[PDB]
Design a protein around this ligand. Sequence first.
Ligand SMILES: Nc1nc2c(ncn2[C@H]2C[C@H](O)[C@@H](COP(=O)(O)OP(=O)(O)OP(=O)(O)O)O2)c(=O)[nH]1
Ligand SMILES: [Mg+2]
Lengths: 140, 98, 51, 345, 76, 120, 105, 172, 320
Amino acid sequence: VKRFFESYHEVPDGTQCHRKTYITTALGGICGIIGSAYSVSLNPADSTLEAVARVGRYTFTAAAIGAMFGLTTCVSAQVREKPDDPLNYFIGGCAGGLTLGARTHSYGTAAMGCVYMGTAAALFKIGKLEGWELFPTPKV
Amino acid sequence: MPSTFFNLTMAFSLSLLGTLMFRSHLMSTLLCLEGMVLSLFIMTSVTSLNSNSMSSMPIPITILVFAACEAAVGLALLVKVSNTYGTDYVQNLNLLQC
Amino acid sequence: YPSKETAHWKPPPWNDVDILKEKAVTNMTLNFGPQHPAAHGVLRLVLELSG
Amino acid sequence: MNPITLAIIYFTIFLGPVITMSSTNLMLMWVGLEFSLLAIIPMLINKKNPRSTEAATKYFVTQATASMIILLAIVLNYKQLGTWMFQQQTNGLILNMTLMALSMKLGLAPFHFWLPEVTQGIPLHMGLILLTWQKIAPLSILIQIYPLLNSTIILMLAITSIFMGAWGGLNQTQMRKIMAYSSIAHMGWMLAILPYNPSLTLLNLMIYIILTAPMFMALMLNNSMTINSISLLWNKTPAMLTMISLMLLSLGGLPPLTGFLPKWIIITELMKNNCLIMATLMAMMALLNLFFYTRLIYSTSLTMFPTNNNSKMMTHQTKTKPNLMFSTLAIMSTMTLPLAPQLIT
Amino acid sequence: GSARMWKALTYFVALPGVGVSMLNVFLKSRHEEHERPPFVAYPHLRIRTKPFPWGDGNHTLFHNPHVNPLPTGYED
Amino acid sequence: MMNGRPGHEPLKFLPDEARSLPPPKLNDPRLVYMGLLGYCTGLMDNMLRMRPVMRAGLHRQLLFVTSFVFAGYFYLKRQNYLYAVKDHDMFGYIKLHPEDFPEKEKKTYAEILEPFHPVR
Amino acid sequence: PFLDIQKKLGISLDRHFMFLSAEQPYKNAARCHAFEKEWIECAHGIGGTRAKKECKIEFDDFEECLLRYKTMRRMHDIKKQREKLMKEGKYTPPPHHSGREEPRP
Amino acid sequence: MNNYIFVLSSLFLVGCLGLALKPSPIYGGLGLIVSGFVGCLMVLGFGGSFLGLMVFLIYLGGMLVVFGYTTAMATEEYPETWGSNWLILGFLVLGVIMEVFLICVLNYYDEVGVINLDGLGDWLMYEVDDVGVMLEGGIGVAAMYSCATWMMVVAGWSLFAGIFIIIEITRD
Amino acid sequence: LRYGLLAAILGDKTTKKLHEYSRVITVDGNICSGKNKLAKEIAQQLGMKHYPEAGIQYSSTTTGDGRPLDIEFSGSCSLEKFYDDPKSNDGNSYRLQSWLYASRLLQYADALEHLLSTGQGVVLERSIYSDFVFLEAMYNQGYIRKQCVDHYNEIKRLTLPEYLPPHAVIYIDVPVPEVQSRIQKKGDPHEMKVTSAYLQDIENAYKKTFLPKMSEMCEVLVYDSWEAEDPTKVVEDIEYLKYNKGPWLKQDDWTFHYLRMLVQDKTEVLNYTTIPVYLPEITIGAHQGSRIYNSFRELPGRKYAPGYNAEVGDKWIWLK
Ligand SMILES: Nc1nc2c(ncn2[C@H]2C[C@H](O)[C@@H](COP(=O)(O)OP(=O)(O)OP(=O)(O)O)O2)c(=O)[nH]1
Ligand SMILES: [Mg+2]
């Protein structure tokens, strides 16, 4: 999946919007199944039916967040024809936050998701433009 | 030898899976620990006989001693749990959460 | 910070010693005899043993 | 507990980690950890209460699983390289086994779920011995293999350790659980600085130890088990509220306390190795750690909680519990910041 | 309780301590056979401004012919 | 990071090369601050054992001051030795690899053209 | 070791059985005795980083000596090609490899 | 007689698999003794009799103590064996099926990796000194009396301390 | 603290200093029934140390100067006020009861430490095992409330099993009308301001709870007034008792050592009596606590640790 997530960065933004939406949906689904596995292991459900239901709900929610985040990011980039601009990822981050608020059924979580995920996606864009290293090898 | 060593590594992996996936018997958990002990002993011993490391032949006996003393301490702790509750069931050990 | 899944907790005891229900002494009841060489044939020794 | 068993158990407690540091062999470091575990189990089950039995059982199963993952890594290395040393070309899978096992040895997140449980239900002296002495031998093994570790999983383990420790410290009221989550955050700091320089890792370990020992001692003076119990310390022992405030502020890392120095120099070398996002996230979670410290200070020193009647006879009686070592460790944990170049190698 | 404690310290600490120190000196005194240093007539050593009020006036009160040379040399 | 240097004695406090260093002058702000820390430790000890703060335990305060200055002096000697060998190894590496540290020709403000940004 | 009491006093509690060419009972050398002997004396005094780079030749000989990863591939390719020729019938086993040889002491 | 050690190690895996599937601890001890016997025969196959016989005898004694404790307190009214639950037999048969599937995949896809069918048994005994005395595994453990002073003293102190440990734990 | 692990290993064995007359004998009875003279004469003709009933000012008399301190230092609870108005709205009754229980706990720690250190037995008056009688008498008479009863029971559960029960419990059976007649005869008007319902509650709590619990773990010596009132037959029976039950049989040197450490450290004796359970009868508050504590600190001989107060004649402060 490393080649896959590297192939996300093969094309500049605003191009292959379907591919970007698909790969970000897949990454959101991976994050969702990890979080749902942690939830069902730390807090066990009363039966396996509602346990796997909770896994499905968390996976669908995280996949929806990733899907609309990547989709809105790509469409905003190609509507503004400005590929390397962090405001497109900020708009995508608020789209993800509004999906989180819609799934949680609370506008407060929607607004908090907008601001936090927009900041996170914007700083992710700045990192991937200006060469920030998240987990650097020790050099000194 | 590589097939046997891989198979012993998967034996350790299965015993670790058993240890990490609890059942209502702490005794069965300790038995899974002893299965891990077996797998570690056999891999160390077969590596010693493969490499003819006559100076590293003490290593299986040392891990034998230390892991069986682990077993003795765990058995004493299980006796304490049974004196407390009447059963060795691991879901009776859940009131330190508060 | 009491929530629904954690409001049932009680504070820990001050001396860390919990009050537990006194468990029933699971003592084995054995019918020593009457068909027993040491019971002389017709003794039903109901024997209430621990070990 | 007779002097014979006291001497045997205390000498084995001392001997385990010293064997681990002094010994070259992975086998001997493993058996030193093994010595430490067997030696410290009976003192956890010393009080013979059900909570002590729970703590001993959880601690034993966690430590045994970690020891056997360590042993798996050692035997797999010895198969791969024929030696008893992670020298230079040992497998990254083996090293990740070692790191996971040593993290669950230590009690940092996401392997942190047992440490508040174990430190709860045990007496305060053994919580102190655990949260100070038991975390040197895994640090000895980790410092032994600093350049070979995977910085990605190191940094991820560290940042989730600080996040979970800060959140748990905010939530909990029991002093032992508060100390456990503080421990988890501090081990996150040491684990993050571990691949870049183990010297600052040892500096942060010593600063954490010399801060944690006298705060635990102040907990020992009245067996102040809860926030309310440390809150009526103004009627119990009023001459120590200032040092309580200063020690908790140094644990929070406010300048000009010397507990700011490990966080500051760790962040400095993190920027020297260009992980600014990592250091920023760690520093804000350290601020959250400082938040629950400040709430504890608000409860115990700056406000004066209501006292009860029998504290009058508490004032009537006299106490000689605070030992000679408390003040020296408190002063070195409070006013040492101008000696920062001497503390840093 | 004080008198018992002091009795125990004397028998189990002080007497073994004197035994170990005596054994140390006794083993050293059997291995060391000191090479008498060569005589050097240093002007600040063996000063005699007035004879001693005993013997010949030239031997010290605790004179030892083997280790203590006169202003002129060793006696042998 | 300097424990692997050649000629490093194992578990040695102050080697003979450290004796080539100038000792601390024994009246310096570091040792004076360590003695003041010892005095504060003695005062804290008196207050915590509920005695007069400075009228009680004069021998205890004296021992605290003496022990603090002793530890501070020897630790200071060790740290000056460590910083001396750090700078010595740094300069030795500089002279050992001169092509990796070229002497840059810094050029004056008559041919460097810095941009001007007017504040208006 | 994290602390060097072992090097300070000169005692050897465990340093004499770190590896294969260390102290062996009754002079029974371990497998790959010379090969990792060359690896140690190549890597001694140059540090861990230099050991991985300019002693790659000595390590690769020892790593393949102990594990025999390349040698198993050579012997399998001998056997896989051999039975491939026997199915087509364009090869015959010799008498000495099929069990009828002239033995020698 | 080339796949003898391989079928032995497969028996060891299925014994450890039953132990992981965790029946009642009496049957767990049964599986642990048969797996220890298999490990004894495996160490015998790869070489010296000493280590295999010692681990075999030690786990005779150890699970003797263990079975005594299962009869003591680790018991219930109706013990669960492997065949007590459909789930346990289900994971047992999927474990056997997955073992067969994994060895077939390692035979086919990766060719000469950890498992090779054509090369099975050819790499069992690597090098043995054909002419020579004192080559058995017990001589090294005997030299641990002389060459391994530190190992002897830490093992003896571990058992001594552990006697004290169990006394204070079960002091009650 | 000279006693410790070093003193124990150098030889301070309580079983070595133990002998035949080293018993804890607690004399108990109703509110006025021959209790003080019986205990002191038993101690006098057995060579034992007599501990009278732990009053409100027990800690004041045993700590520092030994003079009875002022009331808000010694608990701000009045037995006379309890007698005058037992149902007062301030909460005097349970405050007095908890103070008396904690003073009895301090006296029990003192008696246990004296027995374990010197070997001389102790004759207590109305030890901690018979103060829940006054708890239940106040509760059944409606003087206190269920929260106070629960708080007392929690303190008793925290503190009681850490000590050893007395070797002998002597009881004095005197009926309620005779108790009332003796109360009338004594002449304290607050003491005559008691109720026969309260006295019957005390005797009922005795007969229904106190005697069986000590019956299953020590020697019970119920005596009536004329079997009492002449303290020689009780002494003869104490001499010819056989102590073959209770936890005293299984005690050894190190258990005695740890019990001695616990009873000589008074902080862990009175630690669990000061639990921060915020009951309005017991809790005080920051301002009143500060004023009372500062007045206690400016009391003579109480500003510093004992031996360090220069105003009472302590010497060589600068060298200690
Ligand atoms: N309410 C209450 N009063 C108590 C308690 N303990 C003692 N008192 C009171 C009862 C008496 O008025 C007073 C003295 O107690 P005694 O029983 O010793 O009475 P007194 O000495 O007058 O008679 P005596 O000859 O000793 O029986 O203390 C207690 O726990 N609660
Ligand atoms: Mg009386």
